[PDB]
Amino acid sequence: QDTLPVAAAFTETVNAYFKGADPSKCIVKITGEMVLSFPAGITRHFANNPSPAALTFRVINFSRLEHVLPNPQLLCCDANTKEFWVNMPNLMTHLKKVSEQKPQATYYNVDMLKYQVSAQGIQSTPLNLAVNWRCEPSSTDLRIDYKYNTDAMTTAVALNNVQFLVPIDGGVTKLQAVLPPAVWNAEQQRILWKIPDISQKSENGGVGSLLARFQLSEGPSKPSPLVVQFTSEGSTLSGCDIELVGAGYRFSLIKKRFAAGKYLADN
Ligand SMILES: [Zn+2]
Ligand SMILES: [Zn+2]
Ligand SMILES: [Zn+2]
Ligand SMILES: [Zn+2]
């Protein structure tokens, strides 16, 4: 059983732009990459195997992907499934090069597939947002409504390190009625909320509001984009998975994760 243990990862990035409370105006773009990881020692392995067993895999739910770019050195020579035969001499050349360059490395990550995920508006979005501003001549009311949305992801999984940053115009003298607690950057004139986790297991099922009032010393505030951050582990957005075909290899791990890229909301 000289089967090389190997690892795979899908990593997805969701971009979203929300416009007031109007779902039809939400612009969504999801991208991703599939990466193969080879464990230190592969070089010795290929030293014993000049003509190794072919590395062939199949990507599940392939129809959910569009704009697929296969590694032009390692790949490319029907509905929902696509099979690949990795180019072995080029993979070994590669792995020899990076190994003789980072000999201390515990694994070598190789990019196989770059792709886009067919998205359908606000449904494809793991965190729904609606922002409302009330801009008085000397006062500003800010409301951020968020909703954890399981429909965007393959399996119900938490959002981690969630950040809500928003610039406040008009020269703020004082913060009032701030709920939950946030952090005011004075030098930068902008407010930041942090929630460590959001999910079904969160309070109110992952549905919440961020509230702030601001006293101004200069005119009204002009609303600015809410910028959001979060990461996630244990699920993809695309619903893709990977399988080995043929003998000689084993997946030691298949890591699935996604993260917010440009994730904005306007008034
Ligand atoms: Zn071996
Ligand atoms: Zn096929
Ligand atoms: Zn290379
Ligand atoms: Zn990469």
Residue numbers in the entry: 557 to 633, 639 to 828
Copy text from the publication.
The μHDs of SGIP1 and SGIP1α, which are identical to each other, are highly homologous to those of FCHo1/FCHo2.
To gain further insights into the mechanism of DPF-motif recognition by the μHD, we solved the crystal structures of the SGIP1 μHD in two different space groups. The two structures are similar to each other, and the minor differences in the secondary structure composition are probably due to crystal packing effects. Among these distinctive features, the most prominent one is the presence of the SGIP1/FCHo1/FCHo2-specific insertion of a relatively long α-helix (α2) between β6 and β7. Due to this insertion, the loop between α2 and β7 and the N-terminal part of β7 also adopt conformations strikingly different from those in other μHDs. Since these regions contain critical Eps15 interacting residues (see below), these unique structural features of the SGIP1 μHD are functionally relevant.
